[PDB]
Amino acid sequence: SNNVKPQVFNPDNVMMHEKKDGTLMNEFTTPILQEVMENSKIMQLGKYEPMEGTEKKFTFWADKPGAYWVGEGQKIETSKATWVNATMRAFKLGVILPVTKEFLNYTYSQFFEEMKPMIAEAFYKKFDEAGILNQGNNPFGKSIAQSIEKTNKVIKGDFTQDNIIDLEALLEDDELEANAFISKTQNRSLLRKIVDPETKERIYDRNSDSLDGLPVVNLKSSNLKRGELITGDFDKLIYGIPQLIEYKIDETAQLSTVKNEDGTPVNLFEQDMVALRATMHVALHIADDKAFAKLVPA
Amino acid sequence: MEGTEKKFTFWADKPGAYWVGEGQKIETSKATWVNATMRAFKLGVILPVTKEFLNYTYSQFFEEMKPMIAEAFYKKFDEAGILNQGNNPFGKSIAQSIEKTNKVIKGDFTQDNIIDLEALLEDDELEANAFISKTQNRSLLRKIVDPETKERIYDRNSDSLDGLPVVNLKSSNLKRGELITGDFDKLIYGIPQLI
Amino acid sequence: SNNVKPQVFNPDNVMMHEKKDGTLMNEFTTPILQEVMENSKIMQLGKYEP
Amino acid sequence: EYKIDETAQLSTVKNEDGTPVNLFEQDMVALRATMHVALHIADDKAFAKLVPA
Amino acid sequence: MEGTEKKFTFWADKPGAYWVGEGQKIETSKATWVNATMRAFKLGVILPVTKEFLNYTYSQFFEEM
């Protein structure tokens, strides 16, 4: 066909060297990152559990044996122990990044090696918003926010030392103690302006990000609102990783998820392109639905 | 800066990710960068002197005038990049940025408003680094008291507000009622030609 | 699309770890054979030619 | 001969949406086996059959 | 050629000169330049072969081709 104008794609997810206006992108300056790359707050707070299938079983003692006061020559009576079972499964995260091979030679040679950190960050954020907030199409049935909803373990009201202490007290009502807080950085404003009216000490350590002596963890998510704060015994949140982040770079596949201007699927061998596929298998368990509580604006 | 212009490339969008069922199609995504650019403009002044003046009135006039010209340049630059004043040549300034994003508090100087002003940057995960103030603000800043602890947020001894440096502007264009907060590492400046 | 149920296929010859009811086939026991599998009767009866 | 492949399309299998199966997008593997085999009947009179009425 | 485009800059118009009377005003002129560019394009072909052909007819086909 001898058509030499560059290919338009739909969606425009393909990195290209030549722009449709004819601009040809030589002497490219490598973009620089205005931020530190994020990490999974679930993997920071929760307990790791080694997992080898896609599924894991847990079994715990429940009932325990009794005892009796027995007179001399009186018959000693009997007792029993019990256990209970729980289980968690994994799900898969993945993405593909397509590149034209002119781009990977004449614009950005190292593109995939510089994308790898950003793909890992995207997976970690996608996991955190699922397991903490019940957001981003949570595949599990299990999350902190949905545990709080079933137990209704919520305080309604403004940030005060009264409410923040009554929140942490809401766990020991069930014989658990808080290990950390989860909050939104937009609200350390509110933590900074509350003080003990009697000892005249401030509950939030602005210098070290501890609230009431416990560490605060900041979510970058937009789904956790200004007025909302979460507390929990995070040893009761368990995570596992059957497959680490694995990358395959492929020079020959077809991508039916992307189309050419004529409506045809993208074929990487025939159109002279490359793609990176990343996948990960990740599993979440909430070991005790009573272990988490939430403070919410009225 | 080696000429009248500088250019910057930053990552704008990171790639997405998908939950993928077994045997389901993994979908695509893209990274994306953005371009920004910075250019110089010229400050200048001429000082005319008669030869009688320079001979018989004031011999060292230019040598002692040089400092006052440098101050006039610094004041013109500050009054253009902070305030949108002095007939500013650049496209944008701090006052233009505030006016476009509308990050402004209507209110008196109180510890509540000073904390809400600093919080108005945390809305965007930016942490304030300093204040820009009018020295005739001190008669307001020093009468702020924390009603529980009765601590005062403005430190006489180090011209520091809520622990952050306060920097004072000598102009008539920053009024008596007004205070400015920023992450000032987001001011970038360059000087292709010293005076 | 963030769809996590397993793909249905036609004619459905794909071997899959997850069943559509959500059963995960871990702890799987390798199938054993109820027979001895057949040789070719052509190759048993006929003559081979290089 | 057995060839194992991780990136082909299979047109003879279709997704629930009707699309051909792509092994790279869908994170799959396929085994292809092939064999060449030949037959000759050297004398067609050499065979006979008994059949029910 | 590094990358797939190259640029060339050439002198174009050249300054004038004037005949100047004694105490007459000398006039002005300017130099000028122009740009040219050369760009690469891609040649390609695919040669498809059945593996019957590659086994039984012509093993060295993609070497001789």
Coordinates of N, CA and C in Angstrom, one line a residue, chain B residues 17-25 27, chain C residues 1-7 16-18:
Chain B
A17 N -3.9 0.0 36.3 CA -3.8 -1.5 36.4 C -5.3 -2.0 36.6
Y18 N -5.4 -3.3 36.3 CA -6.8 -3.9 36.2 C -6.8 -5.2 37.1
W19 N -7.9 -5.5 37.7 CA -8.2 -6.8 38.2 C -8.6 -7.7 37.0
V20 N -7.9 -8.8 36.8 CA -8.1 -9.7 35.6 C -8.5 -11.0 36.1
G21 N -9.7 -11.5 35.7 CA -10.1 -12.8 35.9 C -9.3 -13.8 35.1
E22 N -9.4 -15.1 35.5 CA -8.7 -16.1 34.8 C -9.1 -16.2 33.4
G23 N -8.1 -16.1 32.5 CA -8.4 -16.2 31.0 C -9.0 -14.9 30.5
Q24 N -9.3 -13.9 31.3 CA -9.8 -12.6 30.8 C -8.6 -11.8 30.1
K25 N -9.0 -10.9 29.2 CA -8.0 -10.1 28.5 C -7.5 -9.0 29.4
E27 N -6.0 -5.6 29.9 CA -6.1 -4.3 29.1 C -4.9 -3.5 29.2
Chain C
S1 N -11.8 -3.4 32.5 CA -13.2 -3.8 32.8 C -13.3 -4.4 34.2
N2 N -12.1 -4.7 34.8 CA -12.1 -5.2 36.2 C -13.0 -6.3 36.5
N3 N -13.2 -7.3 35.5 CA -14.0 -8.4 35.7 C -13.2 -9.6 36.1
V4 N -13.6 -10.3 37.2 CA -12.7 -11.3 37.8 C -13.3 -12.7 37.8
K5 N -14.6 -12.9 37.3 CA -15.0 -14.3 37.1 C -14.2 -14.8 35.9
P6 N -14.0 -16.2 35.9 CA -13.2 -16.7 34.8 C -13.9 -16.7 33.5
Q7 N -13.1 -16.6 32.4 CA -13.6 -16.6 31.0 C -14.3 -17.9 30.7
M16 N -8.8 -24.9 33.0 CA -8.8 -23.7 33.9 C -8.7 -24.1 35.4
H17 N -8.1 -23.3 36.2 CA -7.9 -23.5 37.6 C -9.1 -23.1 38.4
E18 N -9.9 -22.1 38.0 CA -11.1 -21.7 38.7 C -12.3 -22.1 38.0

